[PDB]
């Protein structure tokens, strides 16, 4: 019988909000009838941006920002759910 698991892929810029949401799901699935086999940390992306800090010159003067993106797989505002019934 063709398997139809629920590969959920949460993506967020905050790991605590992603963790709030991993609980939300797993809890609910457990508050119904569903095994989760879940939250599976997938490697956190880290975009980085070395911007010049001065309005004019001063090239060595520079700030470096990052946007880390956390991603969790559960295999049944800020969080990006992507349910994949396969």
């Amino acid at each position: 019988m063709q398997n139809q698991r629920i590969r959920i892929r949460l993506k967020a810029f905050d790991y605590k909000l992603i963790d709030a949401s991993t609980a939300e799901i797993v809890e609910t699935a457990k508050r119904t009838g569903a095994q989760v086999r879940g939250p599976i940390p997938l490697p956190t992306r880290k975009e980085r941006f070395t911007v010049l800090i001065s309005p004019h010159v001063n090239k060595k003067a520079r700030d470096q920002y990052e946007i880390r993106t956390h991603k969790r797989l559960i295999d049944i505002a800020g969080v990006d759910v992507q349910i994949s019934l396969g």
Partner: protein, 127 residues
């Protein structure tokens, strides 16, 4: 499992999974052989150094899987893997290996490039 002693060992960006078995000097690296993996001899010495010390060179079978880094990195990763493997066997093999600077994980890893610098330390030349 068998009498399969296991120890991890890291060095620079390399990580050796080192499995040890009662045996007769069968050193295996990533399904190649000790000398068939590392060429220049240092490496294979370095791997053996803790074996040479405990004096089980040809009383042991090494099933080493190592990833990451380079030759020296991997060599050193395994040395550290075996050190931990050897102390997984006899728990009072420590002082020998400890005092031979084998038990220490060498934390030294590449220093990051830094804005305004060519590298970690190297500055631009100046007028």
């Amino acid at each position: 499992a068998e009498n399969q002693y296991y120890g991890t060992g890291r060095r620079k960006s390399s990580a050796a999974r080192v499995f040890i078995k009662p045996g007769s000097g069968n050193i295996v690296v990533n399904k190649r052989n000790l000398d068939e993996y590392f060429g220049r001899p240092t490496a294979r010495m370095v791997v053996q150094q803790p074996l040479e010390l405990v004096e089980l060179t040809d009383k042991l079978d090494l099933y080493v899987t190592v990833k990451g880094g380079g030759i020296s990195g991997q060599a050193g990763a395994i040395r550290h893997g075996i050190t931990r493997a050897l102390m997984e066997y006899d728990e009072s093999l420590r002082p020998a290996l400890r005092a031979a600077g084998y038990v220490t994980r060498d934390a030294r890893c590449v220093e990051r490039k830094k804005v305004g610098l060519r590298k970690a330390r190297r500055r631009p030349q100046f007028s």
